[PDB]
Amino acid sequence: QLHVVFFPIMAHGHMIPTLDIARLFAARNVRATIITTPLNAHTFTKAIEMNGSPTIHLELFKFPAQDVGLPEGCENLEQALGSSLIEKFFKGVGLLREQLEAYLEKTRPNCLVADMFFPWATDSAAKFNIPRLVFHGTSFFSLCALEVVRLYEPHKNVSSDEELFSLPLFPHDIKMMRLQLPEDVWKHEKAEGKTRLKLIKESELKSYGVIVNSFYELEPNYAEFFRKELGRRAWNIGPVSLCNRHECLKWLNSKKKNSVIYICFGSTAHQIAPQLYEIAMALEASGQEFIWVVRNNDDSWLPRGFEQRVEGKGLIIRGWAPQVLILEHEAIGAFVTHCGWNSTLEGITAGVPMVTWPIFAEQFYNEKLVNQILKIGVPVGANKWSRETSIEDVIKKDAIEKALREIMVGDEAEERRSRAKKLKEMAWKAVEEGGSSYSDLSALIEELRGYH
Numbered sequence: 001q002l003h004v005v006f007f008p009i010m011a012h013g014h015m016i017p018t019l020d021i022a023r024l025f026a027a028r029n030v031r032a033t034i035i036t037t038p039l040n041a042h043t044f045t046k047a048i049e050m051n052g053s054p055t056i057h058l059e060l061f062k063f064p065a066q067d068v069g070l071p072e073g074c075e076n077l078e079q080a081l082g083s084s085l086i087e088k089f090f091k092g093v094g095l096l097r098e099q100l101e102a103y104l105e106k107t108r109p110n111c112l113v114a115d116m117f118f119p120w121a122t123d124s125a126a127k128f129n130i131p132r133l134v135f136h137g138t139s140f141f142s143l144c145a146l147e148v149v150r151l152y153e154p155h156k157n158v159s160s161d162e163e164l165f166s167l168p169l170f171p172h173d174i175k176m177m178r179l180q181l182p183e184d185v186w187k188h189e190k191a192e193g194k195t196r197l198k199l200i201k202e203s204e205l206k207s208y209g210v211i212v213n214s215f216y217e218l219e220p221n222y223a224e225f226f227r228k229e230l231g232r233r234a235w236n237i238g239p240v241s242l243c244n245r246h247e248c249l250k251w252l253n254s255k256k257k258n259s260v261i262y263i264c265f266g267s268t269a270h271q272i273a274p275q276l277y278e279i280a281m282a283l284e285a286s287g288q289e290f291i292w293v294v295r296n297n298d299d300s301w302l303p304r305g306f307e308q309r310v311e312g313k314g315l316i317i318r319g320w321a322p323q324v325l326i327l328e329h330e331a332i333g334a335f336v337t338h339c340g341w342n343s344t345l346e347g348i349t350a351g352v353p354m355v356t357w358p359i360f361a362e363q364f365y366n367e368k369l370v371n372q373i374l375k376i377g378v379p380v381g382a383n384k385w386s387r388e389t390s391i392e393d394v395i396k397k398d399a400i401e402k403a404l405r406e407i408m409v410g411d412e413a414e415e416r417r418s419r420a421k422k423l424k425e426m427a428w429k430a431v432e433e434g435g436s437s438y439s440d441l442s443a444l445i446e447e448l449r450g451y452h
């Protein structure tokens, strides 16, 4: 029996897609083991119980939180707040190498699918002649855009923050500004973050190949560009969440089709009260019906009497929303998102246009994919790459209101809903037998069966 070990980093945006990839391999009669940590194991155990479905095994590693100076309870990337904790977090995940090499010698699996943040996992798997696959959890376009920006540095031929530059080599003219790039790369360059990106991008060529959570038909110019111009060996097997298939739902049943906006900013939602306030003011001015998801830890971010003033039109969800069931409801016709790839794929899979609100990571590249290339989105005006949010950087009510109207009744809004409806169909087509993603998932497994 073929055995594949999955080693995601401890971040929700990477753990959930990695689990879905493990389920996909399990459905093809492949033994799948996921490596996690004790305080994260609940995320997988809960999500495994959703049967008669093949069994996915968990292996728990000790996270050296004390060895790197992290709180003992900091085993997840969403608790490492600030620059100091995040650098301590990546020193900690690096110390997992010993447990990984011990586990690889013990079990001797046929393949290691390891997170993009583990470039050294290629060497660790080589000690036992195990091929290593990289998983990023993002689009081909972000993979290509990150690499072209790293190699050609078009941000040095610029003189001011908002001065635009084109992305080299791309089959589309993509305009970007340095302000959308991390200051760690263009302002006060610190070798720490630059060497980590170098090792991550290099591992895509040094390893056996790349698993990509996308489908070929979604971004074919960049599925090819990644393989040919950038020389990577890759397989598009996404959307991986698809082949594994409440009060707010009753609230929507009585609503018009494609007239409600869904607002949710992911699992990494670090939202401050002044920013939530501008969103509340902008939602009121729009007049649009909405489902708004906020987090927890009350009048310090809400206008007085807000919930009661919009009771018949608006709903605020404070817990964990059933995002997939909400977006695929008929009433939902717009999605304000932070352009994380997992939720961007869910917007595409449901055929819902999006208001793009990038914050950090590769979200600004995903915004370009959604707005300029796929043309199913509208920018909100956010263009400042930042891990946390400064009150100086808050997006005001006026920008949010125009984006809420543009996505609902603005120019081409009915064509964007139509374009998203095809992408929806192509997404389900890609994952069924004979589809693009179903096909080279079989091609990856067959290649793994015959690795010498």
Ligand SMILES: O=c1ccn([C@@H]2O[C@H](COP(=O)(O)OP(=O)(O)O[C@H]3O[C@H](CO)[C@@H](O)[C@H](O)[C@H]3F)[C@@H](O)[C@H]2O)c(=O)[nH]1
Pocket (backbone or CB within 6 Å): 011, 012, 013, 014, 016, 136, 137, 138, 264, 265, 266, 267, 268, 269, 293, 319, 320, 321, 322, 323, 324, 338, 339, 340, 341, 342, 343, 344, 346, 360, 361, 362, 363
């Ligand atoms: O209230 C809620 C809130 C969330 N969810 C679910 O959590 C997922 C959110 O997707 P998302 O890509 O935004 O995850 P995130 O960790 O923030 O993004 C990082 O990981 C991404 C993957 O690489 C990366 O692209 C990005 O830059 C990173 F920031 C998505 O699958 C939802 O279904 C929910 O069900 N209910």
Ligand SMILES: [K+]
Pocket (backbone or CB within 6 Å): 228, 229, 230, 231
């Ligand atoms: K090349």
